[PDB]
Amino acid sequence: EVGYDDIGGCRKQLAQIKEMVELPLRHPALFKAIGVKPPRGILLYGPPGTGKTLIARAVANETGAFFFLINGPEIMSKLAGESESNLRKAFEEAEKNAPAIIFIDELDAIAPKREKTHGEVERRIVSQLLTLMDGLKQRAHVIVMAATNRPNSIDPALRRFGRFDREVDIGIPDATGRLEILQIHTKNMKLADDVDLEQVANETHGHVGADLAALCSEAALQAIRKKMDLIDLEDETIDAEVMNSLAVTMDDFRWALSQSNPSALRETVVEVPQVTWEDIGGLEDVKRELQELVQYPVEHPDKFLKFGMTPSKGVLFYGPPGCGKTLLAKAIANECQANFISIKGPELLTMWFGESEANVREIFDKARQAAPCVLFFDELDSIAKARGGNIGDGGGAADRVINQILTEMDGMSTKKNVFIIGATNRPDIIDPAILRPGRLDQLIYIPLPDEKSRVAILKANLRKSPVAKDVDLEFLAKMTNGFSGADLTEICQRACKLAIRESIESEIRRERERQTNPSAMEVEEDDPVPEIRRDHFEEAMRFARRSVSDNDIRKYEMFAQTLQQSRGFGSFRFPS
């Protein structure tokens, strides 16, 4: 049957559910001699196709509890006045086979009322379901798990104490989980040796477990269409050996990925960033300060408690564009192995234009659920720029979105895990309230990368590309007196583009040469340009440009010295 092996994604909420349900189910007799209330209901919510029903079935099988599935529309499709009988009989049958697990798939259909509550019979169904759910006499060990797309879609009374008192957001699987899902979905098709499922997994961003299964099936169907159809040898049952002779090639998977259309790309991603400190070449003072502020409270919470100091839970990065603030935030999140949530400027601008700031509440709740997390508000000054910056609106710096963010931060800190990081290229226009204590008070300045930092940035950008050892990278980094990280990335991309164009043009001509003058003996000399050379980099650097002018760096230096530690205490000595 289905078990933990079938449950893919390694998303680490299956472990939480296990810890939740073993003792109530794995050790049911224990609770008989101990006075404790187990989890009467667990609400699994997330994007559709994430395997919530699969997870519930696997838990039921691995714990031995009698699994009962109450399909939402199955009862809803039944005639009014007798569907209530179906729900009551389902609970009674689950009660009989104690311990039992009752799974309500698509719970947002039985009790969708969000206090709007249209209709008459559906109100009866929701109220009777409430009576049954609250009617659990704590006898036996029936655990009621329900599936819902979002927590707010179901009736709020279902979310109350004793009905569904604890919720788990399965969420979209990540690259590691996408790879494991691909492995589980590719185990009987005799996958080819060339295909590794790693490149496909990385390119598979935005898919869900159902999406991964559909992509694998589409690749298999492409393989079946490409071969074994030309022969057209078919019978009632295709020969096992004949079908096994085919191997799903990388090309088939690539085409399937091109024909994927993932079912929820837009959904926000809660993922441990893969970026590491290696990608950023320097910022040692900044790196150590970030390590302090974030890592120290958790690695050594006892020492923070000993001195009675509450660590700051907000940091605001300020600096010129393209210097790596987003990368620095990702790296700091990676070092602590905490989930990273990034709120770019377009999202804030959308909330501001639409006059919908309640999304800030939802974003903060999501960050709270995925703890430990690093809630990063990238380019937080976007709203101020949108309203102006030199003259702006007649009013002050306060705006709806920033006010909601401040309210959530003030109401935050309770969680002890969410850490707010803010990045802004225009510190002058940022609202001052953002910098008050209890908010993003720790201001960190990210300067233009140094020569060593520039070398590291070039190496990180060119790690994947084949770069000839002849081209000296230290010389190029030193040559770039004030290039930003974005400028270095542009130079590397232009060099790669030049190399690609030269290689394409050359092999194309060489193919004419073999079509125009058919050679008697075929002897390919391989690639005329196998790796990026000095001339490519020289031509690319010919177009190198400094995006960040020295005047805006001067303004940042002004603000930095606008956070000046006075000029009279530098020699402070105690009287002794």
Partner 1 sequence: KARGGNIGDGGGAADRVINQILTEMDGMSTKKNVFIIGATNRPDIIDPAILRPGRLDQLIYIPLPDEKSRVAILKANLRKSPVAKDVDLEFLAKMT
Ligand X SMILES: Nc1ncnc2c1ncn2[C@@H]1O[C@H](COP(=O)(O)OP(=O)(O)O)[C@@H](O)[C@H]1O
Ligand Y SMILES: Cc1cc(OCc2nnc(SC3CCCC3)n2-c2cccnc2)ccc1-c1ccc(S(C)(=O)=O)cc1
Q: Under the rule (CB under 6 A), what is the footprint of ligand Y?
A: 294, 297-298, 301, 304-305, 308, 310-311, 313, 336, 338, 372, 374, 416-417, 419, 464
The answer to whether 345 is a known ligand-binding residue is no
Backbone region of residue 106 per phi and psi (left: phi > 0; alpha: psi in -120 to 50; beta: other values): left
Choose from a second copy, ligand Y, ligand X, none: what does 53 bind? Cβ within 5-8 Å by kind: ligand X
Shortest distance, position 529 Cβ to a second copy, whole Å: 10
Q: Which of residues 324-343 bind ligand X (CB under 6 A)?
A: none
Q: Is 210 in the site for ligand X (CB under 6 A)?
A: yes
HSE, CB side, 13 Å, CA atoms: give it for residue 17: 32
Task: Give yes or no for a contact between 123 and 94, defined as CB atoms under 8 angstroms apart.
Answer: no
Single residue of 160, 190, 510, 514 touching a second copy by CB under 8 A: 160
Q: Which of residues 213-232 bind ligand X (CB under 6 A)?
A: 213
Single residue of 233, 398, 508, 563 touching partner 1 by CB under 8 A: 398
Contact partners, residue 45, CB within 8 Å, separation at least 6: 52, 147, 148, 149, 150, 151, 167, 168, 169, 170
- Residues 438, 443, 444, CA angle at the centre, nearest 5°? 140
Q: Is 276 in the site for a second copy (CB under 8 A)?
A: no
What does the radius of gyration of the chain's CA atoms come to, in whole angstroms?
30
Task: Give yes or no for a contact between 534 and 470, defined as CB atoms under 8 angstroms apart.
Answer: yes
The answer to whether 53 is a known ligand-binding residue is yes
From the list 77-85, 101-109, 258-266, 304-312, the region that binds partner 1 by CB under 8 A is 304-312
Choose from partner 1, ligand X, ligand Y, none: what does 256 bind? Cβ within 5-8 Å by kind: none
**With respect to ligand Y, which residue has the nearer C-beta, 66 or 304?**
304
Q: Is 284 in the site for a second copy (CB under 8 A)?
A: no
Residue type, 553: I
Q: What's the residue count for the chain?
A: 576
Contact partners, residue 529, CB within 8 Å, separation at least 6: 499, 502, 503, 506
339: phi then psi, degrees, rounded to nearest 5: -60, 145
User: x/- contact string, 312-341, with a second copy (CB under 8 A)?
Assistant: ------------------------------
Torsional sign, CA 467, 473, 476, 480: positive
**With respect to partner 1, which residue has the nearer C-beta, 296 or 543?**
296
Choose from ligand Y, partner 1, a second copy, none: what does 287 bind? Cβ within 5-8 Å by kind: none
Shortest distance, position 453 Cβ to a second copy, whole Å: 19
Task: Give yes or no for a contact between 480 and 454, defined as CB atoms under 8 angstroms apart.
Answer: yes
Q: Is 322 in the site for ligand X (CB under 6 A)?
A: no
**With respect to ligand X, which residue has the nearer C-beta, 25 or 107?**
107
Q: Which of residues 154-183 bind ligand X (CB under 6 A)?
A: 161, 181
Choose from a second copy, ligand X, ligand Y, none: what does 338 bind? Cβ within 5-8 Å by kind: ligand Y
Q: Is 209 in the site for ligand X (CB under 6 A)?
A: yes
From the list 207-215, 284-292, 478-486, 547-555, the region that binds ligand X by CB under 6 A is 207-215
Residue type, 138: Q
From the list 79-87, 136-144, 515-523, 552-560, the region that binds a second copy by CB under 8 A is 79-87
**With respect to a second copy, which residue has the nearer C-beta, 35 or 518?**
35
3-class state of residue 484 by DSSP: coil
Select from 487, 456, 488 the least CA-distant residue to 474: 456
Burial of 481 from C-beta contacts in 10 A (0-12 / 13-18 / 19+): exposed
Return the number of other C-beta atoms located less than 10 Å from residue 172's C-beta.
27
Q: Which of residues 416-475 bind a second copy (CB under 8 A)?
A: 416-417, 433, 437, 464-466, 471-472, 475
**Bridge-partner residues for 444, per DSSP?**
317
The answer to whether 310 is a known ligand-binding residue is no
The answer to whether 54 is a known ligand-binding residue is yes
Torsional sign, CA 389, 394, 396, 397: negative
HSE, CB side, 13 Å, CA atoms: give it for residue 315: 25
Determine the Cα–Cα distance for residues 84 and 569; give it in Å rounded to an integer: 77
Task: Give yes or no for a contact between 143 and 25, defined as CB atoms under 8 angstroms apart.
Answer: yes
Single residue of 308, 437, 518, 570 touching partner 1 by CB under 8 A: 308
End-to-end CA gap in the chain: 78
Choose from ligand X, partner 1, a second copy, none: what does 202 bind? Cβ within 5-8 Å by kind: none
In this structure, what token pair is assigned to residue 382?
């976007």
The answer to whether 12 is a known ligand-binding residue is no
Q: Is 9 in the site for ligand X (CB under 6 A)?
A: yes
Determine the Cα–Cα distance for residues 492 and 465; give it in Å rounded to an integer: 9
From the list 23-31, 43-51, 62-70, 287-295, the region that binds ligand X by CB under 6 A is 43-51
Shortest distance, position 331 Cβ to a second copy, whole Å: 19
- Footprint of partner 1 on this chain (CB under 8 A)? 306-309, 394-396, 398, 569, 572, 574-575
What residue numbers does the annotated binding site for ATP cover? 48-54, 149, 185, 322-327
